[PDB]
Amino acid sequence: EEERQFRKLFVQLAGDDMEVSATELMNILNKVVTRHPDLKTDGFGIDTCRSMVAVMDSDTTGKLGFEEFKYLWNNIKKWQGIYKRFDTDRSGTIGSNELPGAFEAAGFHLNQHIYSMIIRRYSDETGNMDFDNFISCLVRLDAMFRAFRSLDKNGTGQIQVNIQEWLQLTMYS
Amino acid sequence: EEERQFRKLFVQLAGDDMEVSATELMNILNKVVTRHPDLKTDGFGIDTCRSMVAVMDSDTTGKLGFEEFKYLWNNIKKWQGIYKRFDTDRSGTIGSNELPGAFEAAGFHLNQHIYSMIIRRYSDETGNMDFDNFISCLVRLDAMFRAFRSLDKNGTGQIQVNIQEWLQLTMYS
């Protein structure tokens, strides 16, 4: 299967340590997305890669575990398809007319106000967004929802944070 | 003076609106840092630029006001000097041996643990950090401290957040 292949690659990279670095992850992802007829991207940069590693690095190592990798991978794979589905005219961007649906499909019911900020932060002048930013925005959004949830537990929707917890959850992403 | 010059430029860009866009800001910053004999950088990318605009955009416009610009500008200017001071051998990176001081000098007394995460998130394989990341890391750190503080007020060091406030403070940066 697919994951069994990435396992081989993970073993070729870290062996038993089974932890990939940001640079190594970047190269793995770029072979797939950079060489895609429908994606229109230069591939993931190391900064994005470090974000990806940072948000998945549950046990503060600095690398990516294989299971963490799978969660991240199926996310990019899933969002990749949503990107292609909404970039129907193959222009290399998803428009302001399709983005709301792209986000709903990605797994996020965002409030108008929050949606508006996200768009302003990740869209270009025209209000359009490319594959790179789409994935970057979503990896962060998923990480921030996960960060919130880590401090929730009781399910109240209200959390208490001190500056150390704050910086830890926001800086390390 | 210096700021009076940027005012002229701001007027040449937005006139009375006096609000610069991320792309416009990127071009303004790159003329200065990209053409610097001691910096060793390709200049700020639009993503970094959007972050800069997002963290300063106090009244959710999507652009940068001139006063907001000044705060940001004096920060980059200040951090730029700290970068040069610590990249003494002019290699284009600040080492793991100088970074602690670079951060203290920049205005941050960071706890070992938080410092360690930051470094792992922004340093390269070697533990070294370049001008781009130094500024990127600091713009974010300052923004996160400002975000915390916006919800503090009583000065208790403990804040309460709901998911909307959470996403607003972390996504829009």
Burial B22-47 (b: 16+ CB within 10 A, else e): bebbbbbbbeebeeeeebbbebbebb
Q: List Cα–Cα distances, A24 to A8, A89, A147, B125, in angstroms.
A: 14, 33, 25, 11
d(CA B51, CA B64): 11
Residue found under tokens 């129907």: A88
For A61, the token pair is 């190592």
Residues 6 or more apart from B54 whose CB is under 8 A from it?
A: A117, A120, A121, B172, B173
Give the number of other CB atoms < 10 A from CB of residue A86: 22
Q: Under 8 Å CB-to-CB from B17, ≥6 apart: which residues?
A: B63
Helices and strands: H and E segment counts in chain B: 8, 5
CA dihedral B103, B114, A155, A58 (to 10 degrees): 130
Q: How far apart are CA B47 and CA B173, in angstroms?
A: 10
Please check if B42 is assigned to a binding site: yes
Pair of tokens at residue B172: 């829009």
Provide the shortest C-alpha distance from residue A122 to chain B (in Å).
8
Instruction: Determine the Cα–Cα distance for residues A167 and B159; give it in Å rounded to an integer.
Output: 13
Q: Which range marks the domain in which residue A152 is found?
A: 1-173
H or E element that contains A1: none
Tokens of residue A122, six digits: 């990740």
Which of A21, A50, A166 lies closest to B121 in CB terms?
A50
Residues A159, A144: Cα–Cα separation, whole Å? 13
Residue A115 · residue B172 · CB < 8 Å: no
> What are the Cα distances from residue B28, in Å, to A4, A107, B10, B22, B31?
48, 38, 10, 10, 6
Measured CA to CA, the distance from residue A143 to residue A149 in angstroms comes to 10
Residue with tokens 């995460």: B117
- Contact by Cβ (8 Å): A63, A57: yes
Residue B67 CA from chain centroid, whole number: 15
For the CA atoms of A60, A65, A71, A74, the dihedral, rounded to the nearest 10 degrees, stands at 140
Query: Measured between alpha carbons, how far is residue A152 from residues A56, A104, A147 in Å?
Result: 19, 23, 9
Chain A CB contacts of B47 below 8 Å: 47, 133, 136
Exposed/middle/buried for residue A95 (C-beta within 10 Å: 0-12, 13-18, 19+) = middle
Instruction: Please count the residue pairs, one from chain A and one from chain B, whose beta carbons lie less than 8 angstroms apart.
Output: 118
If we measure between CA atoms, which residue out of B125, B130, B128, B126 comes closest to residue A63? Answer: B125
Beta bridge partners of B158: A162
B101 touches chain A (CB under 8 A): no
- CA distance linking residue A32 with residue A94, whole number of Å: 20
CB contact under 8 A, B167 and A121: no
Beta strand spans in A21-109 (E): 64-65, 93-94
Q: Which residues contact B47 (CB under 8 A, 6 or more apart)?
A: A47, A133, A136
Q: Which of A47, A163, A171 sits opposite B157 (nearest CB)?
A: A163
> Are A164 and B111 an interchain contact pair (Cβ–Cβ within 8 Å)?
yes
Binary contact (B60, A157; C-beta < 8 A): no
Please answer whether residues A28 and A43 qualify as being in contact, where contact means their C-beta atoms are separated by less than 8 angstroms: no
- Is B68 annotated in some ligand binding site? yes
Q: Could you report how far apart the first and last alpha carbons of chain B are, in Å?
A: 30
Interface test with B, best of A171, A172, A173 (most B CBs within 10 A): A171
Alpha helix positions (H), B62-162: 66-86, 99-106, 112-122, 131-152
Closest CA to A142 of A44, A6, A20, A51: A51
CA–CA distance, A78 with A61 (Å, rounded to integer): 26
A142 is in an annotated binding site: no
User: Tokens for B120?
Assistant: 């792992």
A158-162/A129-130 β-pairing? unpaired
CATH assignment of the domain containing A78? 1.10.238.10
Count of the separate structural domains present in chain B: 1
Q: Which long-range contacts link B69-73 to residues 24+ away (Cβ below 8 Å)?
A: B69/B6, B69/B10, B69/B20, B69/B25, B70/B3, B70/B6, B72/B139, B73/B3, B73/B6
Nearest to A157 among B121, B141, B163 (CB): B163
